[PDB]
């Protein structure tokens, strides 16, 4: 079901600038964006996605959306920097990840199937074309940064996906 969504699908504006990475992503980061809440319908998780992008370019003065790609409540995986290019998600792993957000909060809801399958899939598809390391390693933000993010319940589900990786003695 999950399609694979340009910037131009949902109305992105241009980066300001863009830096490149080389070589497949050793890592994968997994956020949930808290704010937006979820989003059940494409023309709402386009919004999500343009809310993003607006908050982090026009408030943030990031070059573009901080994340690689974002997932939405429709089961549909929106482009944001995409692969290979430096993100402002997780700070000292923006230059050798993939960072994406499971759009809503995740603290204490599990993300309906057709999100956890639309990552599992974004996934997939990058190792399959050779943009994520075939050893990449998956973490949520909260084992390379204090946070929450991407949710208790979220970092419970993932915790249990293949490539699942402990980085630290805790
Ligand atoms: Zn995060």
């Not at 497949?24 to 989003?39: D, K, L």
């Not at 050798?96 to 599990?110: A, H, Q, Y």
Request: aromatic share 12%; net charge neutral.
């Amino acid at each position: 079901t999950a399609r694979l969504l340009s910037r131009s699908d949902w109305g992105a504006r241009l980066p300001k600038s863009v830096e490149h990475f080389q070589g497949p992503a050793p890592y994968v980061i997994i956020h949930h964006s808290y704010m937006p809440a979820v989003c059940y319908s494409t023309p709402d998780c386009m919004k999500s996605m343009r809310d993003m992008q607006d908050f982090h370019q026009l408030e943030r003065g990031w070059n573009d959306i901080g994340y690689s790609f974002g997932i939405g409540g429709d089961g549909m995986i929106y482009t944001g920097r995409g692969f290979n290019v430096i993100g402002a998600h997780a700070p000292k792993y923006n230059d050798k990840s993939v960072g994406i957000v499971l759009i809503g909060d995740w603290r204490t809801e599990l993300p309906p199937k057709q999100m956890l399958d639309a990552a599992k899939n974004l996934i997939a598809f990058g190792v399959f074309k050779g943009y994520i390391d075939p050893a990449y390693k998956l973490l949520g933000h909260r084992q390379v940064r204090d946070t929450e993010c991407p949710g208790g319940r979220l970092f419970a589900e993932i915790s249990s996906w293949p490539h699942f990786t402990h980085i630290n003695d805790t």
